[PDB]
Design a protein around this ligand. Sequence first.
Ligand SMILES: NS(=O)(=O)c1ccc(CNc2ncnc(NCc3ccccc3)c2[N+](=O)[O-])cc1
Ligand SMILES: [Zn+2]
Length: 257
Amino acid sequence: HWGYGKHNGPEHWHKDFPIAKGERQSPVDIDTHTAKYDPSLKPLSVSYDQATSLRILNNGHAFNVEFDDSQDKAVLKGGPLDGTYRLIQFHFHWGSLDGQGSEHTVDKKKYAAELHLVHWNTKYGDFGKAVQQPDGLAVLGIFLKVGSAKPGLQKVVDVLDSIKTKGKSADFTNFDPRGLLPESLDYWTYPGSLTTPPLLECVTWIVLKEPISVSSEQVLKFRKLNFNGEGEPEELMVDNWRPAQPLKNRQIKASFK
Ligand SMILES: NS(=O)(=O)c1ccc(CNc2ncnc(NCc3ccccc3)c2[N+](=O)[O-])cc1
Ligand SMILES: [Zn+2]
């Protein structure tokens, strides 16, 4: 039922999912002057050398690149986190135009897209149990701006025409997510939620300050995807982002400057 339109988009989600008006919803605007530098925050540890991608899937709301998360192979730790979080999938949110598409904003600036690398806390055993806990997930968010191509993105772009419509999937082995990371791991962090239903309040957000550049041709290929299934009226998969939500209590912390 839910999606991104006039009649089923973000402003409607609260009717099926009442936490949409909850106390720790994401995304949020990151006011860089109000974020508190915390000298006690550690460097983020991203250990993706043994990642095993398996598949790419059009789920009707974005595309997910899925990983084998049945062993510690691609993990996030350090930063603001206690313990170890396993990579389960990544996906993006993007716009119909280069001036919109990100979910988090920086001093109200929208980026063209935002990558989310989704990890679950191994103390809870599996993703499904982790999402039921306030420290269950750690999502690493990375902004995309349009400029030079990101060579490490091109394998993902080139398989999209094989998963054009909702419910399509393709083998996607040997993809290295290190090729999607900017040079700096400086970050902001705050407690929040999934940004799609069920909107569960289980996420430690870690949002990198430095964007990556992708080319106009690469983000063009994202916008050729479809929200509909095969044999249905074509709905381009664009503007699959939730807008910034009220911060309420919450303090955003910065690992730098
Ligand atoms: N946009 S956002 O805030 O980054 C974000 C929004 C929404 C989700 C929602 N993901 C999932 N929901 C159910 N099952 C899953 N997977 C299957 C599974 C279930 C139980 C145990 C193991 C695997 C996944 N999933 O794979 O991610 C994740 C991240
Ligand atoms: Zn996301």
